[PDB]
Structure formats: structure tokens, C-alpha cells
Amino acid sequence: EEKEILWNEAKAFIAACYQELGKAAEVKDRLADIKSEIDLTGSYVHTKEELEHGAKMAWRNSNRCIGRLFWNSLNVIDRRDVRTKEEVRDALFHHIETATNNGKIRPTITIFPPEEKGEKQVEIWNHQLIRYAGYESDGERIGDPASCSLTAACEELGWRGERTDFDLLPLIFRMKGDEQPVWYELPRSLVIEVPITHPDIEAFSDLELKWYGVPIISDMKLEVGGIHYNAAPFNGWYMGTEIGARNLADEKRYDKLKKVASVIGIAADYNTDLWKDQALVELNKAVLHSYKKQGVSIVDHHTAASQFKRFEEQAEEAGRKLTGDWTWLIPPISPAATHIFHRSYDNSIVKPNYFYQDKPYE
Amino acid sequence: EEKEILWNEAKAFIAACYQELGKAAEVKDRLADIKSEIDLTGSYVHTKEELEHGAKMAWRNSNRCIGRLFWNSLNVIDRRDVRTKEEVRDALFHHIETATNNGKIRPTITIFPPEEKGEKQVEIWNHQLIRYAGYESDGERIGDPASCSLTAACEELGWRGERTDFDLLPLIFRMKGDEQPVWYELPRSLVIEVPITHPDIEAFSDLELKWYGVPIISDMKLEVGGIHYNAAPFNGWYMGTEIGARNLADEKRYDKLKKVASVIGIAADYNTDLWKDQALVELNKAVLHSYKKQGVSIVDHHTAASQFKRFEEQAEEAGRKLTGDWTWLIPPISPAATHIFHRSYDNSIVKPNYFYQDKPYE
Numbered sequence: 001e002e003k004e005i006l007w008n009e010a011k012a013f014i015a016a017c018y019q020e021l022g023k024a025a026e027v028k029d030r031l032a033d034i035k036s037e038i039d040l041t042g043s044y045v046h047t048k049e050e051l052e053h054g055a056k057m058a059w060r061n062s063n064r065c066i067g068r069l070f071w072n073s074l075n076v077i078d079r080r081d082v083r084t085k086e087e088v089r090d091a092l093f094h095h096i097e098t099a100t101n102n103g104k105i106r107p108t109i110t111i112f113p114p115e116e117k118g119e120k121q122v123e124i125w126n127h128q129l130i131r132y133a134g135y136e137s138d139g140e141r142i143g144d145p146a147s148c149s150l151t152a153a154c155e156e157l158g159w160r161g162e163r164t165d166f167d168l169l170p171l172i173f174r175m176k177g178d179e180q181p182v183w184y185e186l187p188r189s190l191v192i193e194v195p196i197t198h199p200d201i202e203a204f205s206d207l208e209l210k211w212y213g214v215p216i217i218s219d220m221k222l223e224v225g226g227i228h229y230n231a232a233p234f235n236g237w238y239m240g241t242e243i244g245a246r247n248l249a250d251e252k253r254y255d256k257l258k259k260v261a262s263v264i265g266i267a268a269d270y271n272t273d274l275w276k277d278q279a280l281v282e283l284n285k286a287v288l289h290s291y292k293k294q295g296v297s298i299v300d301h302h303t304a305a306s307q308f309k310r311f312e313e314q315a316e317e318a319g320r321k322l323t324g325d326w327t328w329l330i331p332p333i334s335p336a337a338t339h340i341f342h343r344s345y346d347n348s349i350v351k352p353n354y355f356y357q358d359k360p361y362e
Numbered sequence: 363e364e365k366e367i368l369w370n371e372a373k374a375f376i377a378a379c380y381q382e383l384g385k386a387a388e389v390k391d392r393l394a395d396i397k398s399e400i401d402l403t404g405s406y407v408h409t410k411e412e413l414e415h416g417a418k419m420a421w422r423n424s425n426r427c428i429g430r431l432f433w434n435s436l437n438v439i440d441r442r443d444v445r446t447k448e449e450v451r452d453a454l455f456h457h458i459e460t461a462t463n464n465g466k467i468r469p470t471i472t473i474f475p476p477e478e479k480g481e482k483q484v485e486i487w488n489h490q491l492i493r494y495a496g497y498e499s500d501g502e503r504i505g506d507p508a509s510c511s512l513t514a515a516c517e518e519l520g521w522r523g524e525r526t527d528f529d530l531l532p533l534i535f536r537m538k539g540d541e542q543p544v545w546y547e548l549p550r551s552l553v554i555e556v557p558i559t560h561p562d563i564e565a566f567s568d569l570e571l572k573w574y575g576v577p578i579i580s581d582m583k584l585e586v587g588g589i590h591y592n593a594a595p596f597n598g599w600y601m602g603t604e605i606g607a608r609n610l611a612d613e614k615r616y617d618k619l620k621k622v623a624s625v626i627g628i629a630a631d632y633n634t635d636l637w638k639d640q641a642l643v644e645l646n647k648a649v650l651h652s653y654k655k656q657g658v659s660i661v662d663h664h665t666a667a668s669q670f671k672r673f674e675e676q677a678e679e680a681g682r683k684l685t686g687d688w689t690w691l692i693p694p695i696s697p698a699a700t701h702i703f704h705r706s707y708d709n710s711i712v713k714p715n716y717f718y719q720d721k722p723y724e
């Protein structure tokens with residue numbers, strides 16, 4: 001059944017891919033080559049072109065992503081050649097550097113060798129390449145709660161966090177054949193962070209908030225034409241609400257709204273005062289302001305939604321069906337102020353695509 | 363097939379209803395009585411108890427409603443006895459008075475005679491008993507755009523609006539047998555309106571905004587045990603976001619955010635300033651403030667969500683399955699600040715319930 005599933009996904013992918021790339025007549029020969037390779041090796045190897053385009057289609061198909069207008073400009077790095085843990089490390093280090101691009105973020109994906117027969121060649125443990133540790137001990141809560149289990153897993157491996165609220169986690173990943181993952185501290189020179197300040201309210205600095213510049217999601221599986229690239233970190237730039245409305249605002253994350261209300265000088269006593277709403281708005285304004293001031297790419301939810309509307313228009317005029325997840329596309333602040341809120345989306349899954357996969361710890 | 367559909371809905375309703383009311387042993391006899399009545403008349407008549415409880419269950423089952431905690435305290439008025447257009451008018455007038463209750467709003471439903479064989483006895487044309495007219499002529503836009511087609515329909519019937527932005531529409535409904543609906547101007551003494559002012563910003567009055575006190579939805583069908591009550595207006599009190607975030611804020615409604623930004627003294631030039639978000643928050647604070655100050659019942663979205671959480675807890679501990687529409691339950695401002703955003707809901711349709719029905723005009 002395995003080979004059959006593979007062959008079928010391969011037929012659909014190559015057809016679609018070669019048609020978009022204006023290479024329709026090359027399908028028959030390529031598919032034959034593929035058919036033999038599968039019969040003879042149990043799998044097949046993508047050309048540079050297939051891989052690059054498949055990663056772009058995968059982005060284009062991510063129902064939950066509001067930033068898809070720019071799918072065709074994704075920078076794809078092919079690292080299917082790595083074999084050593086040192087090579088993986090340096091490739092991950094490089095990804096951070098070139099994606100960050102001194103603040104002018106380039107949307108980038110680095111692709112590692114794919115699974116063979118469900119056997120991972122490289123297994124990344126980080127949720128993001130850059131993320132803060134979290135600690136929960138005897139009622140004492142430090143840093144990012146979403147990182148608690150990974151942090152505890154790293155502290156099994158010989159690492160120890162300084163237990164500030166903003167400890168950078170080390171890169172952690174396992175190689176095929178090894179029993180335990182390895183870990184490498186991030187070079188601080190590679191990581192841009194942004195201090196959160198407010199355009200009008202000087203006291204906002206008293207909160208001593210900051211966040212990292214580039215979200216590099218590193219735990220999802222890229223699937224292209226039946227080939228499972230479990231290790232393929234990618235990044236865009238942030239939409240401000242991700243930081244200001246969720247990461248810093250959620251009760252199960254940094255939970256800062258009460259502190260925000262205090263520094264902006266409003267009471268946090270009565271629901272009818274809408275103090276949480278006001279606090280959210282000022283925190284989100286501060287995040288956008290701080291990133292711009294630091295010269296680090298970011299988008300506000302309004303601009304982002306107008307871009308996504310263009311993505312919609314582009315999809316129709318190219319004759320492609322649009323898919324989306326309304327519940328994730330709407331932004332967590334002022335959603336009714338965007339067009340997204342007022343239309344519906346088909347949530348069907350189209351491949352290529354990025355998928356959740358089981359965590360190697362927990 | 364009609365009688366069969368009816369009988370089946372009746373069996374399920376009476377079973378459930380009599381069980382909740384601790385009257386389980388009275389089911390067999392009641393169902394027999396019902397079975398004969400259907401065979402002999404083509405339909406059946408609900409007892410006072412069945413009707414009252416069925417209207418409450420219908421509210422309890424409205425997936426899209428965040429205010430369901432108070433389903434069991436619904437005030438049900440039985441007007442199945444009306445036969446004249448004067449009687450309907452006075453019943454609608456009465457509903458407004460007793461629901462308004464001098465500002466201490468009582469959630470109320472008035473139930474009129476149900477359809478016979480799809481034949482409506484009374485057919486209400488208003489979306490709400492109290493709502494503002496809308497006009498769109500030669501690029502000139504006045505009042506509430508959502509009311510444009512009903513307003514044009516009324517102005518066919520001999521009525522004429524003053525073309526202020528806040529013209530009260532007359533009640534309009536048709537009686538079985540009549541070809542045209544009739545219309546009656548609302549007595550101004552019965553309608554509470556609230557001027558919108560802001561707690562801190564005196565200039566907010568310059569906008570001369572106002573809204574009506576009681577939303578009385580009058581175009582939905584109540585379905586109870588196979589009986590179709592097409593005419594059954596009901597009301598709660600407002601959640602502030604309904605007014606501040608949608609009615610006054612939407613581009614296809616009153617579209618006031620640019621004006622709001624101006625009076626609160628912020629520029630409306632750059633998306634990154636989040637001026638729409640700030641404007642939404644101040645407008646929503648003003649709406650809550652104005653209603654409280656006027657002594658008219660209203661709830662903020664936070665309190666409302668905490669109440670709905672209690673509804674959820676109550677549903678489980680009573681062994682009832684919970685149903686809901688996540689896309690409508692989340693409030694249109696700061697949705698991620700409520701628990702609703704972070705859980706999922708089953709959107710299955712359970713009867714009794716309230717349903718959309720086709721409009722008699724357009």
C-alpha cells in the first residue's frame with residue numbers, strides 16, 4: 001500500500017507542478033522515470049525545480065496562513081545533502097542568518113533529507129529555531145509556559161537555563177542512528193531581538209518586554225508528491241498581533257495585560273471599562289512601533305488582510321480554487337474590521353502542504 | 363409525509379419536554395391525545411406549559427447565542443388567540459412596553475398563531491420591532507443601509523420617512539387573507555433611545571450618535587415539536603459590541619470609525635497606528651457607558667463570555683450536550699481575551715430552535 005500511496009501522490013504532484021511551470025510535455029517521461037525509481041528503490045528523488053516549487057505550493061495551500069500572497073517568492077534552500085550533526089547545525093545557523101538579513105526578513109525554507117520508510121534522517125525538537133525557555137517549579141513561573149516541556153527535556157540533556165524570562169533555548173535535534181539528541185547554544189550575534197517601547201508612553205519601557213525578530217517554525221512536516229520532509233524549517237516575518245495579542249497577552253503565555261494597563265495609566269478593575277481591550281490595542285501599537293524603529297520587518301493585521309484579499313483575487317484570476325481556515329485567518333484583534341471576517345472559506349486540505357507531526361518528547 | 367414529520371417531531375419534543383418538567387409518566391397519554399388530534403385535524407395544539415418550555419429550549423439550543431445562561435428565565439407571552447390586525451398591533455406594542463420595563467429589560471417572547479399547512483396566519487415584515495430606516499438614492503446615503511429594502515417596501519405602502527439618520531420604521535405585517543401588509547407608526551413614548559457619549563471625551567457628543575434600547579428580533583421562526591411559529595418576536599438586552607463594533611462601525615452600516623478617530627483626536631492615516639482598533643475600543647466604551655448612565659440594561663463581551671462559560675458548566679452538570687457556533691460566539695473585539703476563542707464547539711442543530719425564513723418582500 002505504501003508504494004501505491006506514493007505513486008499516486010507523485011502522479012498528482014508532477015502533473016500539477018509541471019503544468020504550472022509550463023513543462024507539461026515532460027510529464028510522461030518524468031513519471032516513467034519516477035515509476036521505475038519507486039519500483040527499484042522504494043522511493044524517488046525530486047529535482048531542484050520540483051522541490052522548490054513544491055515548497056511554494058505547500059505555502060500556497062496552507063489554509064491557516066494569512067500571508068500567502070507572497071508564496072511565489074519563497075527562498076528555498078536545498079540541504080538534502082547533509083549527513084552530520086555539525087552540518088545540520090551549520091545549516092540551521094545559516095538559515096537564521098540569511099532569513100534575518102539584518103532585519104529585512106527573507107521568507108526562507110531549508111529542506112533536509114526526507115523520511116525513508118517512516119524513518120527520520122534528522123529530527124528537530126525545537127518548535128521554533130528561536131524561542132524562549134519556560135519554567136514552572138513550586139508555583140514559580142518564569143519565561144514562556146508554552147516552552148515548559150521542551151525546556152525540561154533540554155535540562156535532562158546537560159543544558160541549564162539562566163532562568164530569566166527570556167532565555168534563548170539551544171537548538172536541539174537528533175540524527176538517524178543516535179539515541180539522544182544533541183544541543184547547541186545559539187550564537188547571540190545571530191539573534192535579533194526587539195525591545196518593546198511605546199510611541200507616546202515613556203513608562204512602557206518599565207515593562208522591559210522584548211521579543212525575537214524572526215519566527216522560524218521548525219517542527220512541521222513538508223509533504224511534496226508523496227515525499228515526507230519532516231525536517232524543513234521555514235519563516236516569514238511576524239504579524240504584530242501574533243506577538244502583542246497572543247504571545248505577550250495570553251494568560252497561558254506571558255500574561256502582561258494587567259501590567260500594560262498599569263503603565264498606560266488605566267484601572268483594571270471593571271469589565272465595562274474594556275481595559276483589556278484598550279491594553280491590547282496599546283501593546284499591539286507598541287509592538288509595531290518597536291519593530292519598525294528597530295528596522296525589523298513586521299506587518300499589521302489590516303495590511304496583512306488587504307494582502308490576503310489580493311491573494312484571493314490572484315487565486316480566482318489564475319483559475320485556482322481557494323482554501324482557508326476562517327477560524328485562523330481572522331486576526332485576534334478587530335477581526336470584524338477586515339474583509340476576512342465577512343466571508344466564508346472552504347477548509348479542504350490540498351497537497352503539497354505543511355502538517356503537524358508528533359513530538360519526539362513528552 | 364407532512365403528518366409523519368409532524369408526529370415524529372412531536373414524539374421527540376413531548377418526551378424531552380415532559381422529562382425535563384418531571385412529568386415523564388404523562389407522556390403516553392399526551393402522545394395518544396396528540397396522535398388522534400393529528401389524524402383528525404392535521405395538527406395539534408400545545409399546552410401552555412409545552413409552549414413556554416419549548417420556547418425556552420429553543421433559546422437554549424441557539425448555537426449562535428452567547429447569552430444562553432438565562433434561557434430558563436425567558437418571559438413567554440401566549441398570543442395564539444389573536445385574529446385581528448388591531449390585536450397583533452396592540453400585542454406588538456405591549457411586547458415593546460413590557461420588555462423595555464423602563465430600562466430594566468426583561469427577555470420576552472410573544473407567540474402568535476402558527477402556520478397551518480405552510481399557511482401563515484400572521485406575517486411580520488420587520489427584522490426588528492424597533493429599527494432605523496435606510497435610504498440610498500443617487501449616491502446619497504442616509505440612515506441604516508441594512509434597512510434599505512424594507513424602507514423602500516414601506517414607502518410603497520403610503521408611508522414616508524423623514525430621512526434623518528435615525529428614522530424609526532413603522533411596524534409592518536400582513537394578516538392571513540389580506541393581499542398587502544398594514545403599517546403603524548411606533549408611539550415615541552414606548553421607544554427608549556440612548557444618546558452615545560464618552561466618559562472622558564466631551565467632544566464625543568459632536569457625533570450625535572444614538573441607538574435604541576431593546577433589540578426585538580421579529581423575523582425568525584420558532585419551531586416546537588413540529589409546530590411552526592413563524593411569528594414570534596423575542597428580545598434580550600444588547601451586548602455592547604453589537605452596537606459599537608458592528609451597527610455603528612461596519613462600512614456597510616453606519617461606518618463611523620473615521621469620525622470617531624477624529625473626535626478622540628487620533629490620525630486615521632496609517633494602518634500601523636492601529637487607529638481603527640483604538641477607535642473601536644473608545645466607541646465600545648462609550649456605548650457601555652451611555653447605556654449604564656441611561657439606566658438601560660446592557661452587557662460587555664467579557665461578562666457575557668463568563669456567563670456563557672457558566673452556561674457550559676451548567677449544561678455538562680445537567681448531562682446535556684452543548685452545541686454552539688464558534689464563528690458567531692466569539693465577540694468581534696478582543697476575541698482571544700475570552701475563553702470561547704480557545705475552545706471548540708459542536709455546531710449540530712437541535713430542536714426546538716429558532717430558524718431563518720424567507721422574507722416576504724425583495
Ligand code: HEM
Nearest residue numbers: 059062064065066067107234235236237238239242299354
Ligand atoms: C511572510 C510573512 C508571513 C506572515 C505575516 C504569516 C502570517 C501567518 C500567521 C499570522 C499565521 C497564524 C499563526 C498563529 O496564530 O499561530 C500563519 C500560519 C501559518 N503560516 Fe504563515 N505567514 C507568513 C509566511 C509563511 C511562510 C513563509 C510559510 C511557509 C513557507 C507559512 C506557513 C504558515 C503555516 C503552515 C501556518 C499554519 C501553522 C499551523 O497550523 O499551526 N507562512 N501565518
Ligand code: HEM
Nearest residue numbers: 421424426427428429469596597598599600601604661716
Ligand atoms: C438576554 C440577553 C441576550 C444577549 C446578550 C444575547 C446575545 C446574543 C448575541 C450578541 C448574538 C449575536 C448577534 C449578531 O451577531 O447578530 C446572539 C444571537 C442570537 N441570540 Fe441571543 N442574546 C440574548 C438573549 C436572547 C434571547 C432572549 C433569545 C431568544 C429567546 C436569543 C436568541 C438568539 C438567536 C436565535 C441568535 C442567533 C440569530 C441568528 O442566527 O441570526 N437570544 N445573542
Ligand SMILES: Nc1ccc2ccc(CCNCCCc3cccc(F)c3)cc2n1
Nearest residue numbers: 065067146215217234235236237238239242
Ligand atoms: N508570521 C508567521 C509566519 C509563519 C508561521 C507559521 C506557523 C505559525 C504557527 C505558530 N504557532 C502554531 C502552534 C501550533 C499548535 C497547535 C495546537 C497546539 C499547540 F500546542 C501548538 C505561525 C507563523 N507566523
Ligand SMILES: Nc1ccc2ccc(CCNCCCc3cccc(F)c3)cc2n1
Nearest residue numbers: 427429508577579596597598599600601604
Ligand atoms: N442581544 C441580542 C439578543 C438576541 C438576539 C437575537 C438575534 C440576533 C441576530 C441579529 N442579526 C441577525 C442577522 C441575520 C442575518 C443573517 C444573514 C444575512 C442577513 F442579512 C441577516 C441578535 C440578538 N442580539
Ligand SMILES: C[C@H](O)[C@H](O)[C@H]1CNc2nc(N)[nH]c(=O)c2N1
Nearest residue numbers: 340341342343344689690691692
Ligand atoms: C462568514 C462568517 O460566518 C460571517 O461573516 C459571520 C462571522 N461571525 C459573526 N458573528 C456574529 N456575532 N455576527 C455576525 O454577523 C457574524 N458574521
Ligand SMILES: C[C@H](O)[C@H](O)[C@H]1CNc2nc(N)[nH]c(=O)c2N1
Nearest residue numbers: 327328329330702703704705706
Ligand atoms: C478552537 C479554536 O480553533 C482555537 O482556539 C484557535 C482559534 N483560532 C486561532 N487562530 C490563530 N491565528 N491562532 C490560534 O492559535 C487559534 N486558535
Ligand SMILES: [Cl-]
Nearest residue numbers: 215242243247
Ligand atoms: Cl510565535
Ligand SMILES: [Cl-]
Nearest residue numbers: 577604605609
Ligand atoms: Cl442589532
